[PDB]
Paper text:
Normoxic and hyperoxic HODH251A–MQO structures validate S101 as an O2/H2O modulator. MQO, a non-reactive molecule structurally closest to the natural substrate, in which the hydroxyl group at position 3 is replaced by the –H substituent. As crystals of HODH251A typically diffract better than those of wild-type HOD we solved the X-ray structure of this variant in complex MQO under normoxic and hyperoxic conditions at the 2.0 Å and 2.1 Å, resolution, respectively. We next inspected electron density maps following the O2-pressurization experiment (40 bar O2 for 2 minutes). These do not reveal changes that we could positively ascribe to O2 bound at the R-site. Instead of the elongated electron-rich density observed for bound dioxygen in other systems, O2-pressurization led to a decrease in electron density at the R-site compared to that under normoxic conditions. Occupancy refinement of a water molecule at this location gives values of 0.67 and 0.48 in the two independent molecules present in the a.u. Remarkably, S101 shifts completely to the trans rotamer (χ1 values of 180.08 and 180.66°) with no indication of the alternative plus rotamer observed under normoxic conditions. Overall, these observations indicate that O2 most likely interferes with H2O binding at the R-site, and although disorder negates its positive identification, this nevertheless leads to the shift of S101 to the trans rotamer that, in agreement with the simulations, appears to be positively correlated with the presence of dioxygen at the R-site.
Residue numbers in the entry: 2 to 275
Amino acid sequence: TDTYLHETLVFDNKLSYIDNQRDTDGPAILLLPGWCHDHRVYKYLIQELDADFRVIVPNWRGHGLSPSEVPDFGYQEQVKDALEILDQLGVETFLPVSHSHGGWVLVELLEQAGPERAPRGIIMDWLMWAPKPDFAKSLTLLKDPERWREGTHGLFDVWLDGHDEKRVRHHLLEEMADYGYDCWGRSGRVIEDAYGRNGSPMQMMANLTKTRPIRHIFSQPTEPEYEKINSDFAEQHPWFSYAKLGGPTAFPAIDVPDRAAVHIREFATAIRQG
Ligand SMILES: Cc1cc(=O)c2ccccc2[nH]1
Ligand SMILES: [K+]
């Protein structure tokens, strides 16, 4: 995967990004990381798609193999960064795919890019409802310069859901280990503000000027009440669908990459037709 890793100057920042520079029929597949992780979350998903698609994975400001303190930014800046990278590469039509709170970037990317460039979207494991007491408590801890690491440990416990899942534990304990208070504190502020300002991922997607096919694919939360908000939103919106992947962790791109990949291919094939 490091075979495909590049660096370029985006506005005032040097950002890393995966590009397999595959020469083939579109759309390109834009994999969008969440907060305080990088392209390494997608290394198994990249292997599923590598052969048949151009695969781009931008890293956010202060994100990558060598994390760094950088000035404050939000999901609006993540979208502009993602699009400046696509402009530099000469990419027109793309299928955005997000993990967790990468979702705020994806939905704003759909709005900013419009349904010509971005006719569909896949959001993976993104909390569709307003924060529950537990998660609200986690964001609080992430913003506390005293208690941010305690914050991340609580989240790691929720995401692993009691599983000895070797590849996901490697991602959280080795691949996220170099991220400090600067990223995590900012993730807490941006996510807490995203919910407060947009209400929920569902309110934000319903509010798009141009609604389009979006699929939520998730393994967590596993409770029937969470599946019901997805089914109820799906019944209300012809353009919304979900699949419960039944993987063990909140990281389906890592632990069920083959399942993640068939939903991406289905949406990529639908774009290729017409
Ligand atoms: C990678 C990743 C997933 C999440 O759900 C999340 C939530 C809060 C802060 C940072 C985060 N980072
Ligand atoms: K539907």
